[PDB]
Structures are given as C-alpha cells and as structure tokens.
CSV table of N, CA and C and ligand atoms in Angstrom, one decimal:
chain,number,residue,atom,x,y,z
U,1,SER,N,0.8,-1.2,0.0
U,1,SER,CA,0.0,0.0,0.0
U,1,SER,C,0.9,1.3,0.0
U,2,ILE,N,0.9,1.9,-1.2
U,2,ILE,CA,1.7,3.2,-1.3
U,2,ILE,C,1.0,4.3,-0.6
U,3,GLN,N,-0.3,4.2,-0.3
U,3,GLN,CA,-1.0,5.3,0.4
U,3,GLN,C,-0.8,5.2,1.9
U,4,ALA,N,-0.2,4.1,2.4
U,4,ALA,CA,0.1,4.0,3.8
U,4,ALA,C,1.4,4.8,4.1
U,5,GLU,N,2.2,4.9,3.0
U,5,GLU,CA,3.5,5.6,3.2
U,5,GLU,C,3.4,7.0,3.6
U,6,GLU,N,4.2,7.4,4.6
U,6,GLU,CA,4.2,8.8,5.0
U,6,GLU,C,4.8,9.8,4.0
U,7,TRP,N,5.6,9.3,3.0
U,7,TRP,CA,6.1,10.2,2.0
U,7,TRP,C,5.1,10.3,0.8
U,8,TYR,N,4.0,9.5,0.9
U,8,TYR,CA,3.0,9.6,-0.2
U,8,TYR,C,2.0,10.7,0.1
U,9,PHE,N,2.0,11.8,-0.7
U,9,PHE,CA,1.1,12.9,-0.4
U,9,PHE,C,-0.1,12.8,-1.3
U,10,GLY,N,-0.2,11.8,-2.2
U,10,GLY,CA,-1.4,11.6,-3.0
U,10,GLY,C,-1.7,12.7,-4.0
U,11,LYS,N,-3.0,13.1,-4.0
U,11,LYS,CA,-3.5,14.1,-4.9
U,11,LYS,C,-3.2,15.6,-4.5
U,12,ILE,N,-2.0,16.0,-4.6
U,12,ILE,CA,-1.7,17.4,-4.4
U,12,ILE,C,-1.1,18.0,-5.7
U,13,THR,N,-1.2,19.3,-5.9
U,13,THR,CA,-0.7,19.9,-7.2
U,13,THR,C,0.8,20.1,-7.1
U,14,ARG,N,1.4,20.3,-8.3
U,14,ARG,CA,2.8,20.6,-8.4
U,14,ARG,C,3.1,21.9,-7.6
U,15,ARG,N,2.3,22.9,-7.7
U,15,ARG,CA,2.5,24.1,-7.0
U,15,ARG,C,2.5,23.9,-5.5
U,16,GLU,N,1.6,23.1,-5.0
U,16,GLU,CA,1.6,22.7,-3.6
U,16,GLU,C,2.9,21.9,-3.2
U,17,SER,N,3.3,21.0,-4.0
U,17,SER,CA,4.5,20.3,-3.7
U,17,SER,C,5.7,21.3,-3.6
U,18,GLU,N,5.7,22.2,-4.5
U,18,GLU,CA,6.8,23.2,-4.4
U,18,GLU,C,6.7,24.1,-3.2
U,19,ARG,N,5.5,24.4,-2.8
U,19,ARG,CA,5.3,25.3,-1.6
U,19,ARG,C,5.9,24.5,-0.4
U,20,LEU,N,5.6,23.2,-0.3
U,20,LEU,CA,6.0,22.5,0.8
U,20,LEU,C,7.5,22.2,0.8
U,21,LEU,N,8.1,22.0,-0.3
U,21,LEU,CA,9.5,21.7,-0.5
U,21,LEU,C,10.4,23.0,-0.4
U,22,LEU,N,9.9,24.1,-0.7
U,22,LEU,CA,10.7,25.4,-0.7
U,22,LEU,C,10.8,26.0,0.7
U,23,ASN,N,10.9,25.2,1.7
U,23,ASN,CA,11.0,25.7,3.0
U,23,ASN,C,12.5,25.7,3.3
U,24,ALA,N,13.1,26.9,3.7
U,24,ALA,CA,14.5,27.1,4.1
U,24,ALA,C,15.1,26.0,5.0
U,25,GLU,N,14.2,25.4,5.8
U,25,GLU,CA,14.7,24.3,6.7
U,25,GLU,C,14.9,23.0,6.1
U,26,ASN,N,14.4,22.8,4.8
U,26,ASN,CA,14.6,21.5,4.2
U,26,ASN,C,16.0,21.3,3.6
U,27,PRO,N,16.6,20.2,4.0
U,27,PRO,CA,18.0,20.0,3.4
U,27,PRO,C,17.8,19.4,2.0
U,28,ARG,N,18.9,19.3,1.3
U,28,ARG,CA,18.9,18.7,0.0
U,28,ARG,C,18.3,17.3,0.0
U,29,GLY,N,17.4,16.9,-0.9
U,29,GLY,CA,16.9,15.6,-0.9
U,29,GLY,C,15.6,15.4,-0.2
U,30,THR,N,15.1,16.5,0.5
U,30,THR,CA,13.8,16.4,1.1
U,30,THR,C,12.8,16.0,0.0
U,31,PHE,N,11.9,15.1,0.2
U,31,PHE,CA,11.1,14.6,-0.9
U,31,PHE,C,9.7,14.2,-0.5
U,32,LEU,N,8.9,14.0,-1.6
U,32,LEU,CA,7.5,13.5,-1.4
U,32,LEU,C,7.1,12.9,-2.8
U,33,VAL,N,6.1,12.0,-2.8
U,33,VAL,CA,5.6,11.4,-4.0
U,33,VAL,C,4.1,11.8,-4.1
U,34,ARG,N,3.7,12.1,-5.2
U,34,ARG,CA,2.3,12.6,-5.4
U,34,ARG,C,1.8,12.1,-6.8
U,35,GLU,N,0.5,12.2,-7.0
U,35,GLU,CA,0.0,11.8,-8.3
U,35,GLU,C,0.5,12.9,-9.3
U,36,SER,N,0.7,12.5,-10.6
U,36,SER,CA,1.0,13.5,-11.6
U,36,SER,C,-0.3,14.3,-11.9
U,37,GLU,N,-0.1,15.6,-12.2
U,37,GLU,CA,-1.3,16.4,-12.5
U,37,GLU,C,-2.0,15.9,-13.8
U,38,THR,N,-1.3,15.5,-14.8
U,38,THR,CA,-1.9,15.1,-16.0
U,38,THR,C,-1.7,13.7,-16.5
U,39,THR,N,-0.6,13.0,-16.1
U,39,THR,CA,-0.4,11.6,-16.6
U,39,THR,C,-1.1,10.5,-15.8
U,40,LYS,N,-2.1,10.0,-16.3
U,40,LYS,CA,-2.8,8.9,-15.6
U,40,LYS,C,-1.9,7.8,-15.4
U,41,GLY,N,-2.0,7.2,-14.2
U,41,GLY,CA,-1.2,6.1,-13.8
U,41,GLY,C,0.3,6.4,-13.4
U,42,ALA,N,0.7,7.7,-13.6
U,42,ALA,CA,2.1,8.0,-13.2
U,42,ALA,C,2.1,8.8,-11.9
U,43,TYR,N,3.1,8.6,-11.1
U,43,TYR,CA,3.3,9.3,-9.9
U,43,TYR,C,4.4,10.3,-10.2
U,44,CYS,N,4.7,11.2,-9.2
U,44,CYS,CA,5.7,12.2,-9.4
U,44,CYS,C,6.4,12.3,-8.1
U,45,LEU,N,7.7,12.2,-8.2
U,45,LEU,CA,8.7,12.3,-7.1
U,45,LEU,C,9.2,13.7,-7.1
U,46,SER,N,8.8,14.5,-6.1
U,46,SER,CA,9.2,15.9,-6.0
U,46,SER,C,10.3,16.0,-5.0
U,47,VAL,N,11.5,16.6,-5.4
U,47,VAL,CA,12.7,16.6,-4.5
U,47,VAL,C,13.3,18.0,-4.4
U,48,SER,N,13.7,18.4,-3.2
U,48,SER,CA,14.3,19.7,-3.0
U,48,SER,C,15.8,19.6,-3.2
U,49,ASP,N,16.4,20.7,-3.7
U,49,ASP,CA,17.8,20.8,-3.9
U,49,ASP,C,18.2,22.2,-3.5
U,50,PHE,N,19.5,22.3,-3.4
U,50,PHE,CA,20.1,23.6,-3.0
U,50,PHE,C,21.5,23.7,-3.6
U,51,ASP,N,21.9,24.9,-4.1
U,51,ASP,CA,23.2,25.2,-4.6
U,51,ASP,C,23.4,26.7,-4.6
U,52,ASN,N,24.6,27.1,-4.8
U,52,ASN,CA,24.9,28.5,-4.8
U,52,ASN,C,24.4,29.2,-6.0
U,53,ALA,N,24.2,28.5,-7.1
U,53,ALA,CA,23.7,29.0,-8.4
U,53,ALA,C,22.2,29.3,-8.3
U,54,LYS,N,21.4,28.3,-8.0
U,54,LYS,CA,20.0,28.4,-7.9
U,54,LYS,C,19.4,28.6,-6.5
U,55,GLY,N,20.2,28.4,-5.4
U,55,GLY,CA,19.7,28.5,-4.1
U,55,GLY,C,18.8,27.3,-3.9
U,56,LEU,N,17.8,27.4,-3.0
U,56,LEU,CA,16.8,26.3,-2.7
U,56,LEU,C,15.9,26.2,-3.9
U,57,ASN,N,15.7,25.0,-4.5
U,57,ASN,CA,14.9,24.8,-5.6
U,57,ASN,C,14.3,23.4,-5.6
U,58,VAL,N,13.4,23.1,-6.6
U,58,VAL,CA,12.7,21.8,-6.6
U,58,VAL,C,12.7,21.1,-8.0
U,59,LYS,N,12.9,19.8,-8.0
U,59,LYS,CA,13.0,19.0,-9.2
U,59,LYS,C,11.9,18.0,-9.1
U,60,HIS,N,11.3,17.6,-10.3
U,60,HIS,CA,10.2,16.6,-10.3
U,60,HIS,C,10.6,15.5,-11.3
U,61,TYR,N,10.3,14.3,-10.9
U,61,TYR,CA,10.7,13.1,-11.7
U,61,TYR,C,9.4,12.2,-11.9
U,62,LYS,N,9.1,11.9,-13.1
U,62,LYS,CA,7.9,11.0,-13.3
U,62,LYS,C,8.2,9.5,-13.0
U,63,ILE,N,7.4,8.9,-12.2
U,63,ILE,CA,7.5,7.5,-11.9
U,63,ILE,C,6.5,6.7,-12.7
U,64,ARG,N,6.9,5.9,-13.6
U,64,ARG,CA,6.0,5.1,-14.4
U,64,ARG,C,5.7,3.7,-13.7
U,65,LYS,N,4.5,3.2,-13.9
U,65,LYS,CA,4.1,1.9,-13.3
U,65,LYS,C,3.5,1.2,-14.5
U,66,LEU,N,4.1,0.0,-14.8
U,66,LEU,CA,3.7,-0.9,-15.9
U,66,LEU,C,2.6,-1.9,-15.4
U,67,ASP,N,1.7,-2.2,-16.3
U,67,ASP,CA,0.7,-3.2,-16.0
U,67,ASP,C,1.5,-4.5,-15.8
U,68,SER,N,2.7,-4.6,-16.5
U,68,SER,CA,3.6,-5.6,-16.5
U,68,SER,C,4.3,-5.7,-15.1
U,69,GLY,N,4.0,-4.7,-14.2
U,69,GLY,CA,4.5,-4.8,-12.9
U,69,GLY,C,5.5,-3.8,-12.3
U,70,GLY,N,6.5,-3.4,-13.1
U,70,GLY,CA,7.5,-2.6,-12.6
U,70,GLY,C,7.3,-1.1,-12.5
U,71,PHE,N,8.0,-0.5,-11.5
U,71,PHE,CA,7.9,1.0,-11.2
U,71,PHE,C,9.3,1.5,-11.6
U,72,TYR,N,9.4,2.7,-12.2
U,72,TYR,CA,10.7,3.2,-12.6
U,72,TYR,C,10.6,4.7,-13.0
U,73,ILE,N,11.7,5.3,-12.9
U,73,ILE,CA,11.9,6.7,-13.4
U,73,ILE,C,12.6,6.4,-14.8
U,74,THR,N,13.6,5.6,-14.8
U,74,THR,CA,14.2,5.2,-16.1
U,74,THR,C,13.9,3.7,-16.3
U,75,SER,N,13.6,3.3,-17.6
U,75,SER,CA,13.2,2.0,-17.9
U,75,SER,C,14.4,1.0,-17.6
U,76,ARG,N,15.6,1.5,-17.6
U,76,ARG,CA,16.8,0.6,-17.3
U,76,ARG,C,16.9,0.2,-15.9
U,77,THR,N,16.2,0.9,-15.0
U,77,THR,CA,16.3,0.7,-13.5
U,77,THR,C,14.9,0.5,-12.9
U,78,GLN,N,14.4,-0.7,-12.9
U,78,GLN,CA,13.0,-1.0,-12.4
U,78,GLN,C,13.0,-1.6,-11.0
U,79,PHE,N,11.8,-1.5,-10.4
U,79,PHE,CA,11.6,-2.0,-9.0
U,79,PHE,C,10.2,-2.7,-9.0
U,80,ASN,N,10.0,-3.6,-8.1
U,80,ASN,CA,8.7,-4.3,-7.9
U,80,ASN,C,7.7,-3.5,-7.1
U,81,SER,N,8.1,-2.4,-6.4
U,81,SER,CA,7.2,-1.6,-5.7
U,81,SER,C,7.8,-0.2,-5.6
U,82,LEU,N,6.9,0.8,-5.4
U,82,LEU,CA,7.2,2.2,-5.2
U,82,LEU,C,8.1,2.3,-4.0
U,83,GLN,N,7.9,1.5,-2.9
U,83,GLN,CA,8.6,1.6,-1.7
U,83,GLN,C,10.1,1.2,-2.0
U,84,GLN,N,10.3,0.2,-2.8
U,84,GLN,CA,11.7,-0.3,-3.2
U,84,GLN,C,12.4,0.8,-4.0
U,85,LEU,N,11.6,1.5,-4.9
U,85,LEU,CA,12.2,2.5,-5.7
U,85,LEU,C,12.7,3.6,-4.8
U,86,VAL,N,11.8,4.0,-3.8
U,86,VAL,CA,12.2,5.1,-2.9
U,86,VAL,C,13.4,4.7,-2.1
U,87,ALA,N,13.5,3.4,-1.6
U,87,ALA,CA,14.7,3.0,-0.9
U,87,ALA,C,15.9,3.0,-1.7
U,88,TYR,N,15.8,2.6,-3.0
U,88,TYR,CA,17.0,2.6,-3.9
U,88,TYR,C,17.6,4.0,-4.0
U,89,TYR,N,16.7,5.0,-4.3
U,89,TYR,CA,17.1,6.4,-4.5
U,89,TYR,C,17.5,7.1,-3.3
U,90,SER,N,17.3,6.5,-2.1
U,90,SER,CA,17.7,7.0,-0.9
U,90,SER,C,19.1,6.7,-0.6
U,91,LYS,N,19.7,5.8,-1.5
U,91,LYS,CA,21.1,5.4,-1.4
U,91,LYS,C,21.9,5.8,-2.7
U,92,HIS,N,21.2,5.9,-3.8
U,92,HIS,CA,21.9,6.3,-5.1
U,92,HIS,C,21.3,7.6,-5.6
U,93,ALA,N,22.2,8.5,-5.9
U,93,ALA,CA,21.7,9.8,-6.5
U,93,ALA,C,21.4,9.5,-8.0
U,94,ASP,N,22.2,8.7,-8.6
U,94,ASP,CA,22.1,8.3,-10.1
U,94,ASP,C,21.8,9.6,-10.9
U,95,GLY,N,20.7,9.7,-11.6
U,95,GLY,CA,20.4,10.9,-12.3
U,95,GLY,C,19.6,12.0,-11.6
U,96,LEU,N,19.2,11.8,-10.4
U,96,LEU,CA,18.5,12.7,-9.6
U,96,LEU,C,19.3,13.9,-9.1
U,97,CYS,N,18.6,15.0,-8.7
U,97,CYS,CA,19.4,16.1,-8.2
U,97,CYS,C,20.1,15.9,-6.9
U,98,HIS,N,19.7,14.8,-6.2
U,98,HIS,CA,20.3,14.4,-4.9
U,98,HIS,C,19.6,13.1,-4.5
U,99,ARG,N,20.3,12.3,-3.6
U,99,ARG,CA,19.7,11.1,-3.1
U,99,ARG,C,18.5,11.6,-2.2
U,100,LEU,N,17.5,10.8,-2.1
U,100,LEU,CA,16.4,11.1,-1.2
U,100,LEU,C,16.9,11.0,0.2
U,101,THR,N,16.6,12.0,1.0
U,101,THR,CA,17.0,12.1,2.4
U,101,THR,C,15.9,12.0,3.4
U,102,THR,N,15.0,13.0,3.6
U,102,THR,CA,14.0,12.9,4.6
U,102,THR,C,12.6,13.3,3.9
U,103,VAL,N,11.6,12.8,4.5
U,103,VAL,CA,10.2,13.1,4.0
U,103,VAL,C,9.9,14.5,4.3
U,104,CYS,N,9.3,15.2,3.3
U,104,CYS,CA,8.9,16.6,3.4
U,104,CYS,C,7.9,16.8,4.5
U,105,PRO,N,8.2,17.7,5.4
U,105,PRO,CA,7.4,18.0,6.5
U,105,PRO,C,6.1,18.7,6.0
U,106,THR,N,5.0,18.5,6.7
U,106,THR,CA,3.7,19.1,6.4
U,106,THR,C,3.7,20.6,6.8
C,1,LIG,C1,5.9,14.1,-12.7
C,1,LIG,O1,5.2,13.6,-13.2
C,1,LIG,C2,6.6,15.4,-13.1
C,1,LIG,C3,7.9,15.3,-13.7
C,1,LIG,C4,8.6,16.3,-14.3
C,1,LIG,C5,8.0,17.6,-14.3
C,1,LIG,C6,6.7,17.8,-13.7
C,1,LIG,O2,6.3,19.2,-13.6
C,1,LIG,C7,7.2,20.2,-13.7
C,1,LIG,C8,6.0,16.8,-13.1
C,1,LIG,O3,4.8,17.1,-12.4
C,1,LIG,P1,3.5,17.0,-13.1
C,1,LIG,O4,2.4,17.0,-12.0
C,1,LIG,O5,3.3,18.2,-14.0
C,1,LIG,O6,3.5,15.7,-13.9
C-alpha cells in the first residue's frame, strides 16, 4: 500500500509540492511522491535541492508503473514496488538532483 506511506502525499498539485519543499529548513533531498497532474497512472517524485547558483529549488521526476508490474523513473532501472524505488534512490543519486534524504514536513 503506497497510500500507507508517510512520503505519499497523493493528490496534491505541483505548486503545492513546491510550496511544501521550498522551506528554508529543508535540506537537499527532502522529498514526497504525489500523483502526476496530468499523466494517468504515473506518480511524481518531487525533490528539494540547493546550490549557490539556484539556491533552494525543486525537481520533479515522473515515476511510471507498468501493467507488467515494474515501477521506474528510467526503464533501465526498475523495481517491484514504489517503496523499493524510494529505498534505492535514498542510497543512489544516479540521475536525480540528490539522493532522497527525509520526508517533506507538512
Ligand atoms: C511528474 O510527473 C513530473 C515530472 C517532471 C515535471 C513535472 O512538472 C514540472 C512533473 O509534475 P506534473 O504533475 O506536471 O507531472
């Protein structure tokens, strides 16, 4: 159950995800997963970042889910569940702006 997950914010808008993530107290990698605004069946991983060029900012990554079963951001790297995907990206930055660190505070 992905809805049981504390990092799953469900049906919130992209603007709302940015409002929650653009809090000065959020370190790099603060994140949440929400439904995509327009892609049916896809989730969206919203992640905070920070650098001297952009300062505090937010990145969004589409998470696909196949009827065939797998969840992924890139088709080359798939998982059996959204939870496993989140766990993998909490250890590997790979192509993301930062590895996932802590769940976005309400
Ligand atoms: C996720 O689906 C996603 C990925 C990349 C960019 C955006 O919006 C900027 C995004 O959020 P969405 O709700 O528009 O799909």
